[PDB]
């Protein structure tokens, strides 16, 4: 169940999307973040993602709506599909392998900070077969673990 800290980690995630801090995530804002992640959703697809979370249907997502959905998916730890979605965000060229360059790019955009040293250690810890890339099987073990 929810805690003061977890709420701050969610407000974190919400701020990535709500660029102008007006307290709401718009269709336009979601598009900007998605494109920074290597995706190119049409306005129709953007509207549908907003609608999934827009509980009062005013066309945008506010923090209470964002929290509701996030806390609910979290209560769910059978989210195998959520993990594939995260994998897809990383694997920009869709070859089934997350390269050090792909990992660094997403981290730099997801509001993170990683030195090439940390980027390599991140991969090295999950790279079970040692090819320098993180395949899907490896990603799951890396994500489902701690």
């Amino acid at each position: 169940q929810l805690t003061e800290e977890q709420i701050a980690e969610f407000k974190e995630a919400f701020s990535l999307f709500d660029k102008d801090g007006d307290g709401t995530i718009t269709t336009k804002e979601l598009g900007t973040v998605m494109r920074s992640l290597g995706q190119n959703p049409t306005e129709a697809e953007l509207q549908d993602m907003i609608n999934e979370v827009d509980a009062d249907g005013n066309g945008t997502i506010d923090f209470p709506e964002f929290l509701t959905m996030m806390a609910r998916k979290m209560k769910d730890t059978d989210s195998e599909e959520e993990i594939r979605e995260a994998f897809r965000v990383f694997d920009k060229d869709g070859n089934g392998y997350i390269s050090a360059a792909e990992l660094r790019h997403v981290m730099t955009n997801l509001g993170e900070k990683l030195t090439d040293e940390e980027v390599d250690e991140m991969i090295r810890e999950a790279d079970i077969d040692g090819d320098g890339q993180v395949n899907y099987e490896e990603f799951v073990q890396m994500m489902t673990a701690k």
């Binding site: 980690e9 999307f17 993990i83 250690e121």
Partner: peptide, 21 residues
């Protein structure tokens, strides 16, 4: 990709701790 982006953010958090030590 809201929750998927959170998962990624959460994994990095976990990393920066398995680093802190």
């Amino acid at each position: 990709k809201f929750y998927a982006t959170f998962l990624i953010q959460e994994h990095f958090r976990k990393f920066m701790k398995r680093q802190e030590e």
